[PDB]
Design a protein around this ligand. Sequence first.
Ligand SMILES: O=C(O)Cc1csc2ccc3ccccc3c12
Ligand SMILES: O=C(O)Cc1csc2ccc3ccccc3c12
Lengths: 343, 343
Amino acid sequence: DVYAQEKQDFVQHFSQIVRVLTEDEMGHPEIGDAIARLKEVLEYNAIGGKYNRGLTVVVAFRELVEPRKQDADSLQRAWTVGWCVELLQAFFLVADDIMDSSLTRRGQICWYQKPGVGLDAINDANLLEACIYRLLKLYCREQPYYLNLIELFLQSSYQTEIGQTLDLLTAPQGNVDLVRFTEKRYKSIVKYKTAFYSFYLPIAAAMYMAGIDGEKEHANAKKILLEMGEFFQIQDDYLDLFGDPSVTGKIGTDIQDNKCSWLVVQCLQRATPEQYQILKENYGQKEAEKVARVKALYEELDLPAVFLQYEEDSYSHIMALIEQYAAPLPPAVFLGLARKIYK
Amino acid sequence: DVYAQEKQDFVQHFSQIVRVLTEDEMGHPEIGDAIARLKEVLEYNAIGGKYNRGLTVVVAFRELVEPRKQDADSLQRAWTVGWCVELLQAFFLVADDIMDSSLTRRGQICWYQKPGVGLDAINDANLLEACIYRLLKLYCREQPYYLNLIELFLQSSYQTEIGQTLDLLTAPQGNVDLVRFTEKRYKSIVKYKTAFYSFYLPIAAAMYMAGIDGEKEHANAKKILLEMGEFFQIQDDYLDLFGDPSVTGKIGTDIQDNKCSWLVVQCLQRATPEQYQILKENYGQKEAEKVARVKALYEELDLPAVFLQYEEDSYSHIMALIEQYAAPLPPAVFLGLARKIYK
Ligand SMILES: O=C(O)Cc1csc2ccc3ccccc3c12
Ligand SMILES: O=C(O)Cc1csc2ccc3ccccc3c12
């Protein structure tokens, strides 16, 4: 497929990415040990996911830039920017795993949990961030959209950080206070912490590289992409519990982590004073018994049905948004992405 | 004095800095709680130091830009960039205190050690970083040196991070291995982790704002400033032990922290097989008895004398560097700074 076939050339470019970044020890053998540590940080944290966001940069690029203007250097730059996106995500994940004390990521042990790393992962996360800008300078220094990408990456980081701050305030590390789990807060968290960098960033980057720097073009694409981002995260929350581990490829624990999941938000709106106490006394527990009890209150409230209803209405809304805001961009850009997200 | 008088206008501008940054909740009440947290992060971590680096931006600006080209808006921008420097430092300090598990900073409790903060300080540190770029956009978006400052701040961050990585590798959190405490490693650490952002960054920023964007002008200033940075840190290490708490305003613990101090590096070069074992069995201990023992081996090796000798030779070298590389810049720019560092 569009991704399956392109995913190969994208992942293989990583070797060049790492080479070019670890090429600073060239005229500076003094920082050699630091550069080696950097290479270990990159190879462990940037590899191992699905690379969809980075891949979305490359895919969108081919659909926005004319075939002739797609020389070897242009595609080289597109692969790099796509990788910068993955780097931005690695930066967040490494730091987020530390903040929430996670044990594993992608079935693999969290970088900071590795023997000899620990809190040093904080500096490792900052380096992943810095490599984003080192790569842009190395490959797009002479491009007319150089400053655009820099500002875009910086803005995405800030949004994500703001969203993470909001998330940390909403679901503390010891406050099951369901009072703040509102739908307005949930949407705000998803928008800033996930939607902006996951859906807008990748497409916006391809846009700038294609010369589409118009503020209106970006605002129109933003309206569409932020909406897909919200649906993506809502579906992700639903699947985290009612999903099938065989298909998804992972087990959910949002309930055990007192997460401000879409499910809990729905349950809070659809619960009587008695039901509230049931959730207010089961949300955030390692007891498989207390968790299964929660999943029970959800089914009883037919949340899965609500989700199904929301999904259909969501697919309709997004299709309407695409028809209205896609132009002048090729609708395929958004349609191809929506097809991968919606079931 | 030049600083003492200007320090007032600089510190007072902070209120405007915070106002302008916390003005994002304006058209977005949704992220209000996040913006309030941000304001607490800023007011606690950016205030409380001496502000010399930020101040050095303002001072250098007045000496590089003609009096007429110093309108109210130009000085406004200079104060902001100076504050961005302080923000970059706050970002490093907050993150460094967490990484080395410090208890206090500036006599005050480390932000992350505050009740309710903890590892969330990681996200707080990333925000301080982001505010640097938000301020540059807000005040220098239309300036011709905009991209210059962005690249400068990004480069300084990367250097500092690289230097921190090197430092973490050199003096682990449980490896008193004095084998890596060489002078070449010491100089590398100081250059990347301290000199670049502390001495080059501030002056380089004033340079770009003054239109001095020449690569040669910056390379010449870099040679001078990196040298002052090295001396600054060496003197700082010496004072950390042999200094007077009344004058310095703090007690040293580099020996107790197994720091790769200039002193220990000197001691390793000036120690016989028997003396080495003495240090190899006392460096990095909380026992005031074992620490005083170390200070003893230093005095015996007349390190203070060595430092004194190094200081004089250092002042001569730096003066030679200024006479050779200052032009076309006003020598005062470097002389004023050197006068503040050298005793
Ligand atoms: O990354 C995933 O695992 C979801 C996913 C599956 S396929 C796919 C295609 C494009 C994306 C863009 C942004 C975020 C996600 C995705 C995604
Ligand atoms: O910041 C300090 O405490 C040392 C100091 C004393 S006065 C002063 C003036 C300019 C500086 C520039 C960079 C770093 C330090 C300083 C510094």
